[PDB]
Swiss-Prot record:
Belongs to the phosphate/phosphite/phosphonate binding protein family. InterPro entries: ABC_peri_PhnD-like, PhnD. Coiled coil: none annotated. SUPFAM superfamilies: Periplasmic binding protein-like II. It comes from Prochlorococcus marinus (strain MIT 9301). Keywords: Periplasm, Signal. This is Probable ABC transporter phosphite binding protein PhnD1. GO terms for biological process: transmembrane transport. The complex may be composed of two ATP-binding proteins (PhnC1), two transmembrane proteins (PhnE1) and a solute-binding protein (PhnD1). Pfam families: Phosphonate-bd (PF12974).
């Protein structure tokens, strides 16, 4: 459907949260751009990348890694925007309380996760897999060192929390924002979890648009679209509803050069 602007997103959180966020976003874009806009859910991160490649998704909220993947598979696509926090994003390592493991203060303390049952997020997650594995590796910890010589891949940050909180795994890593989100707001999900370590900063989430939108939507559509997103204003009611769902005060400009470190780490870990 070429007259419909199709919004996608990596499924980094439970679908109820995604539905609310992306449906509201899509409605606001629709009003401001005067085109039909539909949020199209996907089953996993790979599906977001593939949907974008096959031009079944036009505008997608990607993670660092998956956005890089998408843009490598889909030449001449456009980096649109990010949040302030996405310039200085962090992961957390969390542990189940039943371990009585205490927090650490130097990356080398990740050695204490050896011989535990460990879960990452999505195989293609920046904050729940790539960066955690990078830092584990810096500390001499490899996946083979976990219980079973393997790690879990939960597929989402909410799913990681649930797995470690239930005791299906001993420890995991996830999006720091999502963690703090749950700690404060929905603490029944984090009942059995303690903070183990906070990572250094890296770049993460961003919006990516197809590069050929002008042919469907007219001259200047992309600039207008970019403008809509960047001009969302917390002082406005409907805008604030959206922005609060992204846990941000605004969107800001983002560019492709920013993701060089993610791309390089992705190559090193054979995750491109």
């Amino acid at each position: 459907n070429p007259k419909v602007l199709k919004v996608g997103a990596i499924p980094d959180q439970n679908q109820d949260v995604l539905d609310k966020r992306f449906n509201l976003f899509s409605k606001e874009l629709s009003k401001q751009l005067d085109v039909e806009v539909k949020y199209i859910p996907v089953i996993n991160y790979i599906a977001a990348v593939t949907g974008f490649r096959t031009k079944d998704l036009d505008l997608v909220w990607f993670g660092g890694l998956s956005g890089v993947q998408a843009r490598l598979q889909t030449p001449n696509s456009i980096v649109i925007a990010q949040r302030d926090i996405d310039k200085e994003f962090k992961s957390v390592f969390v542990v189940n309380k039943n371990l009585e493991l205490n927090s650490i203060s130097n990356i080398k303390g990740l050695k204490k996760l050896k011989n535990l049952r460990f879960t990452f997020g999505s195989e293609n997650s920046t904050s729940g897999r790539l960066m955690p594995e990078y830092f584990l590796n810096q500390a001499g910890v490899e996946i083979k060192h976990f219980k079973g010589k393997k790690a879990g891949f939960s597929g989402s940050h909410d799913a990681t929390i649930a797995l470690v909180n239930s005791g299906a795994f001993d420890a995991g890593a996830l999006n720091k924002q999502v963690w703090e989100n749950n700690l404060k707001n929905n603490p029944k999900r984090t009942s059995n979890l303690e903070l183990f370590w906070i990572t250094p900063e890296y770049v993460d989430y961003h919006w990516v648009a197809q590069g050929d939108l002008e042919n469907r939507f007219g001259e200047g559509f992309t600039k207008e679209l970019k403008s809509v997103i960047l001009n969302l204003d917390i002082k406005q009611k409907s805008h604030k509803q959206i922005l609060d769902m992204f846990n941000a005060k605004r969107f800001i400009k983002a560019e492709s050069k920013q993701y060089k470190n993610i791309e390089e780490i992705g190559r090193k870990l054979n995750k491109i």
